């Protein structure tokens, strides 16, 4: 009995949480995807470059 009341109160509580809107959500997603992509390309480039440098210097 109390579990249904508790879950009803959970969905009542979630309507008071201050969720972000659409525009800041897509802006934040642009930031995190851009940083993930940039640091992926960054670490790949530096790994290839210093591996070639190590195989040059022995």
């Amino acid at each position: 009995q109390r579990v249904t009341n508790f879950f009803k109160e959970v969905v009542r509580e979630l309507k008071k949480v201050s969720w972000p809107n659409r525009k800041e959500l897509v802006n934040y997603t642009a930031v995190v995807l851009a940083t993930v992509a940039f640091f992926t390309v960054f670490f790949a480039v530096i790994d290839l470059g210093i591996s070639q440098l190590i195989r040059l210097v022995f």
């Binding site: 509580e13 008071k16 949480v17 201050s18 969720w19 972000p20 959500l25 934040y28 997603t29 995190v32």
Partner: peptide, 9 residues
């Protein structure tokens, strides 16, 4: 991002 950046004020 939707879960994490949400606050109960």
């Amino acid at each position: 991002i939707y879960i994490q950046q949400a606050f109960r004020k």
